[PDB]
Design a protein around this nucleic acid. Structure first.
Lengths: 190, 245, 30
RNA sequence: AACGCGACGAUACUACCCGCACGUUGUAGACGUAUAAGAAUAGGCUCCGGCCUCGUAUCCUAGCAGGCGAUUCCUCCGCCGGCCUCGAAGUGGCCGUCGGUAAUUCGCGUAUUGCAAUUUAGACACGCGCGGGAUCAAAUCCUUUGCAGACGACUUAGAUGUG
RNA sequence: GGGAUAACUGGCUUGUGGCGGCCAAGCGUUCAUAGCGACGUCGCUGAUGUCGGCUCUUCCUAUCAUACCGAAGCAGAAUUCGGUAAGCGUUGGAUUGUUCACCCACUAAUAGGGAGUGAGCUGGACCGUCGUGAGACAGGUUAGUCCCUACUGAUGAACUCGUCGCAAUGGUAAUUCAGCUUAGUACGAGAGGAACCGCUGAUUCAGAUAAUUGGUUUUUG
RNA sequence: CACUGUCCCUAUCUACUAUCUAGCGAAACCACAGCCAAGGGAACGGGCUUGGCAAAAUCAGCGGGGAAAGAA
RNA sequence: AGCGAAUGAACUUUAAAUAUGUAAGAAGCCCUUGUUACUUAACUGAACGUGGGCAUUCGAAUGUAUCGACACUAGUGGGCCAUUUUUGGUAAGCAGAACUGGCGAUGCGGGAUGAACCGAACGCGGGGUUAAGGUGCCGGAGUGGACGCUCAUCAGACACCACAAAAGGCGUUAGUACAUCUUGACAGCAGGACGGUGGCCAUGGAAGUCGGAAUCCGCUAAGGACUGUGUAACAACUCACCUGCCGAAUGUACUAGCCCUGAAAAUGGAUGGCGCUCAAGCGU
RNA sequence: CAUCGGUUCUGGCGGGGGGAUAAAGGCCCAGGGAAUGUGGCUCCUCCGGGAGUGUUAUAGCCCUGGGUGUAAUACCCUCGCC
């Protein structure tokens, strides 16, 4: 129908500096730096108030206006991770074979790796390399819990999902074999 | 056009009321106005309002109304040209939020004396501050979460176990029995579902209700009343502390 | 999917009628 | 790739190379055959002043098809040397010498091609010329071998040698 | 005896019957009725035998197996149903003689098809005579339509002869089973009974090779 | 009951050819020609359309094409 | 069309569309009178004519590059396809009849190609203008102009039936009808979701939720003798419905375009080819 | 090459006629009306932007009738000239 104007708003907290190039978005704050490229969507970024980012499209369709809603949440997610961060808590359960989980930090390539051993008695080791920017720690607070924390929700949630998919039973009965590692809590560090 | 969410039709016996319920509430208040002497206005701000049935039964002398605030505003009459008695428009000025009406014939002082004397303990409701720090113990969890001593308690149902994990406790089943860490104990610390001086999230309120831990008091605060014979309204310590519109 | 939509619209209409409201086998088998 | 390409060795004749001299020498077609950022296009460039639809731009562009001297100059162009640079199918820069040179100005020539007739002019390649440098080779046949073989073709050995 | 037609099919075919009643959004000569009218629901319901066998290469998927997923009281084991998949494989007996359908053994499995009505080897019709409730005739006549190219190899003129190279393009390759460990473990009342990682062989296919074994002998030794 | 390359599963040896040379030296057959694919209503191409392509001259093998029922 | 004309395709004042038969003057006449074996009660009629005139539009239009009669002579004497009208039948095919057109004896332009399509008919040349068809280029001529629509895991591309439907699409755009909304509609979040009542039979047990039948009342803001999860039965959760907060437009069924699916085998290939996406596709 | 004859293609210029003697439009006159309300106040997270107020004021608009006015111009048809 070619709507003439459509706009949305991203509020910015006082401890942040948001810098936008052509469509490259950089958010700085207490916890670190996040960048992501938005050249695949036609959008006009602007400044409306002291702490408000204005994003507009002109002469777009219903599809192009709706693509403004995904970029508003994506930038707002970068605001949250830079301020408060993200935390995924994962529990691993077993019936007879205890699951040994080992987390080391690689000096080269600068990323954590999680090694899963003894999954329903299997002798294969399962190595999962994490995304750059997510730290994994063994919970010395409850039994059989890992914490995946970081600034990027994309990096934390994908690395958590990689662990689930690497410990998955095959050629068995789902109703009886309940062994696996599962995401228990999702939220913020602060 | 297309790409739309499909509404689910409900194969069930009760349907939306709509216009007929609104005019029925208009008519029922309309015949109630001449029959009684005093119209008391009250608020239950952030209560669960399940004990209003009890104040209905033991106060069979009076007629009690609790519905849409806008509908009771016009039923009494917001404008002074459209009103069924003098001073009703000032009674509509107290109708702001979760506000009810009390059509009574007895003494105004007797109603205030009774509503101050009534007190019931109820569940927390979201957005409240927490008066206590409550904690489920480390080992086997129970029906009340440790409020009653465990020797007089009953173990919690295994049906509740997926719900407790969803609401945030790391709870597992050993030998058909719902427990937090190990069945014997230790191997963890207890789970704190609320802390003192913390606003209660709805997740925490659902956890306190499930163990039947009560942290809030159900009370009815009278804003004011209007006398049919006299014709004006009066306020008592609750109209000052709450915004009116 | 054509047969399911016919069945579900029959279920809607039968419910709407019932909620608003408040021999050949024998001859053969003989 | 038997009509795709690279590196290297030796290249006798002829003429392999250098210089300049001309061709009834041949072209899918010379006539100023002039012009390097990268990147984005819901953004860029900048001397940080500002600028951006626009290459209708910039350079070059005058003189018998285009001299000799003067003043003025280190303006533009070109050839050879030294130092370096240029490998994706390989080149430009700096310095120096020499030569030419309206940037300003000047003296003396053009006629008759007769009122137009391609303005024979460029480039690469191919030849013939001189006068100068340089060079002194291989392959096939034949005999032999059998790691090969229908015939060809292929692996070899035939110059004095561990033949 | 005369007439007409002078073979047929070609965006063909596939998985779900027909009749009758009820319901039925619509349409109609204006529209739930002139009438047409879907989905449902209700009522009724051993074949065979001129047919088979064999055939390289290539392609199709409408997949039997091998690979990977989804679902099932799928405990484990064995499976069943469906999805993506043609990369790779896909036997022999008996069975009246034939095809099978069943039934047996081996196997991972013993899938089905195509090369416009597929393509190759193998196991007659006219008059004449005598009749006609009906045929017969050593009676006559007659029809049987070493070269180019493709492929596989081998040379080759012109670029001076060679030596060492690059790689456009074309082709392309591996397949299945078993045993040891995991482990008599997980799982299971019992009977039973896995899998990942690791290790070692074998079947089929493909490319070489002759130390050894066997075979061959004009070494005419 | 015994043997047997019938087969599993095929290998090897000999003679004459096939090959090359010297001499001698035909015939069959021959409109002109010979790379494919899709289309060319009359299920008919080899000459047309528009694509793939396409490089002299030759030597040996093959078993494909340059061949074929006719309709009651 | 009307039946405020009558009567009732078979009704009509009038009257379509579409083709079709017959006549339109010099051969017709008119006025006077000659014959006849025809005819009449009869100088009455029918045929052929004599004498005058209508000869200047002489009795609609348009055309006319002549038409008629006799005698003689040569080749011919098959159909195929299509439009329209009509007859009969089938699951669908198809079969017959009448007119007309095309081809057979016909070259040329176009549809990539060509028996049956479109344009147009032919001496040898030069110049101009066009038809059908086209202007991304192979290809002469527009990457011409205006407004929209479409993204297809082999779209579509110029003159179309079948598959195929009362068919599936949480693809996209336009429209129609109905409905809800500052008396807070659609969606969410926080709460309520009660009492008689574990309603009645039945079951070892069955409390709304294994079954059979009824399905009422109170409190109401509203809440089913219950829509699902769950228990051995309960409990617990959830839905329907209701209130508070945020905010102004929504949502149901159809219709119309364009797009996806709506079935495909077997040498490698076809909008003619490259290729084309605010087109080089679709409509005007 | 100049001046012509015949056919033809293609630019430019000067007139005439017709519409509603175009419709519009500019500048004046006389009425009427509104809002996507100009100027004037109140509230307003004060580099600013809004909510309410009302018929020309510190901008303007729309409708009707009249004058300049047989106005101009588009379109169509026409007489010509380079």
């Amino acid at each position: 129908m070619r709507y003439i104007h459509s706009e949305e708003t991203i509020p910015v907290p006082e401890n942040l500096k948001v810098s936008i190039k052509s469509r490259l978005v950089t958010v700085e704050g207490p916890r670190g730096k996040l960048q992501k490229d938005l050249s695949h969507i036609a959008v006009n970024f602007s400044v409306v108030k002291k702490g408000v980012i204005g994003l507009e499209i002109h002469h777009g369709s219903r599809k192009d206006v709706a693509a403004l809603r995904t970029v508003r949440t994506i930038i707002n997610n970068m605001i949250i991770g830079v301020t408060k961060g993200f935390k995924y808590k994962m529990r691993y359960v077993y019936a007879h074979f205890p699951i040994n989980v080992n987390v080391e930090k690689n000096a080269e390539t600068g990323c954590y790796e999680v090694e899963i051993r003894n999954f329903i008695g299997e002798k294969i080791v399962r190595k999962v390399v994490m995304a750059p920017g997510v730290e994994v720690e063994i919970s010395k607070a409850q039994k059989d819990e890992l914490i995946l924390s970081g600034n990027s929700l994309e990096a934390v949630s994908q690395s958590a999902a990689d662990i689930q998919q690497i410990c998955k039973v095959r050629n068995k009965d789902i109703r009886k074999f309940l062994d696996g590692i599962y995401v228990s809590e999702k939220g913020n560090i602060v | 056009p297309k790409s739309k969410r499909a509404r689910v039709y409900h194969l069930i016996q009760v349907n939306k009321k709509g216009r007929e319920a609104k005019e029925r509430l208009f008519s029922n208040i309309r015949e109630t106005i001449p029959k009684y002497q005093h119209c008391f206005v009250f608020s239950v701000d952030n209560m669960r309002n399940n004990y209003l049935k009890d104040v209905r039964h033991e106060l069979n002398d009076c007629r009690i109304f609790f519905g849409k605030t806008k509908l009771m505003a016009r039923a009494l009459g917001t404008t002074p040209e459209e009103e069924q008695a003098d001073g009703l428009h000032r009674l509509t000025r107290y109708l702001t939020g979760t506000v009810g009406l009390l059509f009574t014939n007895r003494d105004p002082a007797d109603i205030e004396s009774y509503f101050s004397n009534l007190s019931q303990v109820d569940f927390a409701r979201a957005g409240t501050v927490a008066p206590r720090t409550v904690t489920v113990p480390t080992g086997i969890v129970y029906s009340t979460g440790g409020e009653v001593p465990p020797e007089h308690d009953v173990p919690v149902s295994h049906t509740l176990e997926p719900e407790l994990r969803r609401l945030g406790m790391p709870v597992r089943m050993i030998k058909g029995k719902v427990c937090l860490g190990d069945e014997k104990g230790e191997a963890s610390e207890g789970y704190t579902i609320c802390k003192e001086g913390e606003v209660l999230d709805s997740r925490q309120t659902r956890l306190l209700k499930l163990f039947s831990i009560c942290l809030s008091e159900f009370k009815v605060s009278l804003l004011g009343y209007w006398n049919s014979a006299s014709g004006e309204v009066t306020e008592l310590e609750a109209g000052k502390t709450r915004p009116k519109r | 999917r054509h047969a399911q939509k016919i069945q579900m619209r029959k279920a809607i209409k039968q419910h709407e009628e019932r909620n608003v409201k408040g021999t050949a086998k024998a001859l053969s088998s003989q």
